[PDB]
Subunit: 257 residues, 4 copies
Amino acid sequence: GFLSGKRILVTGVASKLSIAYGIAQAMHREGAELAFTYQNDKLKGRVEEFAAQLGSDIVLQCDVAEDASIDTMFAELGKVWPKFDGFVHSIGFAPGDQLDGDYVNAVTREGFKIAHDISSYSFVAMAKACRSMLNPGSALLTLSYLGAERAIPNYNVMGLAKASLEANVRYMANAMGPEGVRVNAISAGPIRTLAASGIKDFRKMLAHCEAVTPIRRTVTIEDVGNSAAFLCSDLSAGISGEVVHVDGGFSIAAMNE
Amino acid sequence: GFLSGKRILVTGVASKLSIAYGIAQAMHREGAELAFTYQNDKLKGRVEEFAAQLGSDIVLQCDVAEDASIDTMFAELGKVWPKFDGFVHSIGFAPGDQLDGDYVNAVTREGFKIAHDISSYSFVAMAKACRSMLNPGSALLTLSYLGAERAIPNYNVMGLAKASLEANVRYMANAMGPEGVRVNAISAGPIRTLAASGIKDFRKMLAHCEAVTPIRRTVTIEDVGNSAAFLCSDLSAGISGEVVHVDGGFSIAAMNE
Amino acid sequence: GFLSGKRILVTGVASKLSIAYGIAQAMHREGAELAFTYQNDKLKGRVEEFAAQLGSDIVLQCDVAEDASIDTMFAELGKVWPKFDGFVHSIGFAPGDQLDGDYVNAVTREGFKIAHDISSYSFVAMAKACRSMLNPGSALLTLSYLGAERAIPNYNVMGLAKASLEANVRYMANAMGPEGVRVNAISAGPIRTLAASGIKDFRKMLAHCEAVTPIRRTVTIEDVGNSAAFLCSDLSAGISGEVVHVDGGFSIAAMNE
Amino acid sequence: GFLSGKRILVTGVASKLSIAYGIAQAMHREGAELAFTYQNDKLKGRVEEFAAQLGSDIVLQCDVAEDASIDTMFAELGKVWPKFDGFVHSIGFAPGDQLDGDYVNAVTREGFKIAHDISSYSFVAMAKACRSMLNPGSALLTLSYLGAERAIPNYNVMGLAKASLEANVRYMANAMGPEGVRVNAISAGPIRTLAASGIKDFRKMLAHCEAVTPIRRTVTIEDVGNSAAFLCSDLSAGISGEVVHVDGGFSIAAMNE
Ligand SMILES: NC(=O)c1ccc[n+]([C@@H]2O[C@H](COP(=O)([O-])OP(=O)(O)OC[C@H]3O[C@@H](n4cnc5c(N)ncnc54)[C@H](O)[C@@H]3O)[C@@H](O)[C@H]2O)c1
Ligand SMILES: NC(=O)c1ccc[n+]([C@@H]2O[C@H](COP(=O)([O-])OP(=O)(O)OC[C@H]3O[C@@H](n4cnc5c(N)ncnc54)[C@H](O)[C@@H]3O)[C@@H](O)[C@H]2O)c1
Ligand SMILES: NC(=O)c1ccc[n+]([C@@H]2O[C@H](COP(=O)([O-])OP(=O)(O)OC[C@H]3O[C@@H](n4cnc5c(N)ncnc54)[C@H](O)[C@@H]3O)[C@@H](O)[C@H]2O)c1
Ligand SMILES: NC(=O)c1ccc[n+]([C@@H]2O[C@H](COP(=O)([O-])OP(=O)(O)OC[C@H]3O[C@@H](n4cnc5c(N)ncnc54)[C@H](O)[C@@H]3O)[C@@H](O)[C@H]2O)c1
Ligand SMILES: Oc1cc(Cl)ccc1Oc1ccc(Cl)cc1Cl
Ligand SMILES: Oc1cc(Cl)ccc1Oc1ccc(Cl)cc1Cl
Ligand SMILES: Oc1cc(Cl)ccc1Oc1ccc(Cl)cc1Cl
Ligand SMILES: Oc1cc(Cl)ccc1Oc1ccc(Cl)cc1Cl
């Protein structure tokens, strides 16, 4: 495939519904050698199966909430992979209470901090921890959401976190560009996952989205997976600091009433 | 003036170079009744001085780094201003080490945290606290910067914080609109302030914008002042959750070579 | 008023519902000396009436569809206003057939042409003609619409014309800045004007924005009027080549469901 | 390849330097069946060789300046291809005089009209002429430039034309989406071509661009070709109405002084 000869790390695989699973399948199909990470123990088994299925025996625990965890993970990886070609950042979190009802009422200093820390800093934290291991032509990918561009009901603080994320890409793209490291982000529409079961009245969100979307259908972890694969391949050598919207063109329309 | 009868709380005045000083200046001119806060005891005296110059004697202290400091301040304000028409958020901060050299090499979890806390969270924090005190037709206003839109050397983390800031404006604007609260932001061009001091090659940064800026000059606190007075008046009763660029059209140009 | 001593040429007044009528209204209030043009003989009388109401007797004719009509008008203006401080461009047009149904099925080379000519080109056309007549500190201003930023049903071609318009503002702003000419645009929310009449389900379009708009109401010509007066005054001497959205923050929201 | 089983039309092949040549090579390599069009006779031979090299014997004359030419071209094509999967729009023109020196001075009603007609309308004109021939999952691609977003010296009117182009994509994406037709555009940085020899002081443009670009190098017709191939393949089924910047991240940086 067009990913043949690429060693890529994939974070965030929690279920077969995970956007990361979609990205992995695609990259694997496209010839990429993979590695996986799992947040905690309660996902060791699950992630270990997916990896096996994807022909990968590199599965490591790590928690972005802790530097050490990030440092240790890249420590083990360096044993099998002293040098790879980027990783996929499919990480984001926010205390439930924060994602329901009035934003001004919901938001808290703690919640605000946690959301930005995991959903944003986590990205540069990893890059920072593996800067010297990256090969020339390497690529970093991260997932975002329209919430970073507009005020969406209930998304609340995740919105600010995503806005911070998206700027991180521009700041990361500019800094590592000279070394030959591209940094981009995919803005995917709403998908069928576990975390969304987290956001309030998510399911109506979807329905509206698929009725009013140009392509008239919501995006799959497949649509997102392929764009991701391409974005991490040399095929996109010319693109960096970009946030391509993979939401079947939902954000560019208005009043499709 | 078109600000007559209005009661506005101004924050961020640290010196005569302060942007807020320019804002308070214009606002007072257009006839609004002002209130001033000051971060700490080191600043108290001077703010009290400017306060007097502007016919004000309401000079409360407030360190947005603390929720106790914010509640107590608004509790003190309610004593004389049981109700008021908004406030100008002119605060921003990040450890010095953060604004120098490689963004990825310079950034840290702690720095990222503080920048986002003092610079982004504080805005809503202040809103949350005074929500009930705001009259219909009230207007909140904060200051941002291009760093939010594009990767600017040395600006680093502050850029992410501003991105989060600007998202905040939109989320705040959408939540309080129905109650009659407008929220906007002014993305200002650089101005030699005490803060600018900490920023590397700022003096050089100012020089580049000047020659390449459409209006062939950098903006003044007077420029920002007049705009904030407008954005904070009933004259802009149709503008909300907007980020108006007051940088003499620097951002809309390219390769002015 | 903050417009005192200023001499502004206002175009586009067709009725009391006209946005320009709102602009002229506010401008006159803030004390600017006005000049009015009228497209044709069908309109002459009414414009002359409004002109009188606003202490003006300078009512020239101008059909931006012709370069001869533009030169002659400014030639007529120079008679009494050898020098002035800018003009408000409030013109837009496109064959009716263009604003109904499938954009691709509705569009035509001729329609595309006329929309772009009357709506986009005319702005610079008028600038080219009065360039030498503008005092330093002058300000040009045009009206645009969201259609420029996102595909809005039925708006069709006008959207492309507005996109070109907004680009014009930026290119015009960068070219005249050095001479001291500021150029900006107001992207206004819908308002029931004679023109709106031609637009399908506009009445329905207004209803959607109202309920989903942050400030829970659509803007008024008064709203636009106050903003244009500002953008056309020395108060905004730091804003150029900018497109300030005066739509009550409708555009910065999403799924207000 | 990932384009296997796709019939695609490629317009704008004038030289081996042409961006279109780059897109063709890539698509061919990726398994796509191709067709070519040439503006006039003076390019019949050249384009006929490239096509042969690319294993294509479908080469037709056509001129977007004329509907009939567009109608006739799709007439012949329909004989061999009664149904294909999109076409590549690599068309744009503007009278030289328009692309040099002061924009306000340079721009003319004629020049303005011609630029928009060929550089913008040409796109929907073709789509309009081949709507019924397109298969489900088809994709339309068009090339744009940062000039559509910022005021670049000398680009002048091409800027407005590109801005109109980019809106056309959103309006075209929204209208044909429901039929299963994606419409996107690639915003490529400056490249080594014939038309650029057209724009004034183009070569300094480049140099600045490659010195200040994150990836620290200008994009090739290869980088642009691959992104184009991907954009026209099912791999990007989730993306539409998008304008991905293929300029090595130049637009997202600032003051890389
Ligand atoms: N779900 C959607 O519709 C949608 C749309 C756009 C963007 N996104 C974004 O795409 C990414 C993927 O999310 P998803 O929808 O696949 O959800 P998911 O629950 O399947 O994946 C989220 C993952 O984050 C990981 N994670 C959370 N906190 C962590 C921490 N402290 N340390 C280490 N790992 C941690 C979890 O282990 C989990 O695998 C997120 O950034 C999400 O916001 C989702
Ligand atoms: N200076 C420029 O060129 C420029 C350009 C765009 C935006 N801005 C923004 O303008 C705003 C005002 O900054 P300035 O340039 O006037 O500098 P300044 O140094 O005059 O103002 C900074 C202020 O922040 C206050 N502050 C810091 N930490 C605080 C805390 N924890 N609690 C309470 N108050 C605290 C200080 O007391 C001080 O008054 C900032 O938000 C900055 O990002 C400045
Ligand atoms: N109405 C809205 O809700 C809304 C929202 C955003 C922007 N706008 C814009 O506001 C501007 C003013 O329109 P309006 O809503 O006030 O409608 P209107 O019908 O009151 O104004 C249109 C004007 O265009 C003038 N005009 C048309 N063709 C002309 C030509 N060839 N030469 C000279 N003058 C010509 C007419 O004489 C008329 O005064 C337009 O640019 C429109 O796109 C309107
Ligand atoms: N050259 C760059 O650096 C750059 C950067 C961004 C975008 N672009 C754009 O990419 C596209 C490709 O241009 P290029 O750089 O390959 O130049 P080019 O001269 O190689 O290609 C332009 C083509 O337009 C065709 N054309 C012009 N007028 C026509 C008409 N009336 N009818 C039919 N065909 C016509 C010509 O025949 C020619 O093949 C253009 O839209 C250009 O603006 C170029
Ligand atoms: O960002 C998302 C956007 C959408 Cl539409 C759906 C799911 C998303 O993902 C999350 C949402 C909230 C939290 Cl707390 C964590 C994650 Cl991963
Ligand atoms: O945001 C700014 C942008 C510019 Cl051009 C100049 C000064 C700015 O303001 C700051 C920069 C750094 C820190 Cl620590 C604090 C502040 Cl207030
Ligand atoms: O641009 C507009 C946007 C809106 Cl919401 C309402 C009216 C508008 O204005 C026009 C629409 C069509 C034509 Cl033919 C002429 C004009 Cl002035
Ligand atoms: O759009 C372009 C942008 C760049 Cl940087 C280089 C070349 C470009 O292409 C053109 C420029 C002017 C004309 Cl008249 C025609 C074309 Cl095809």
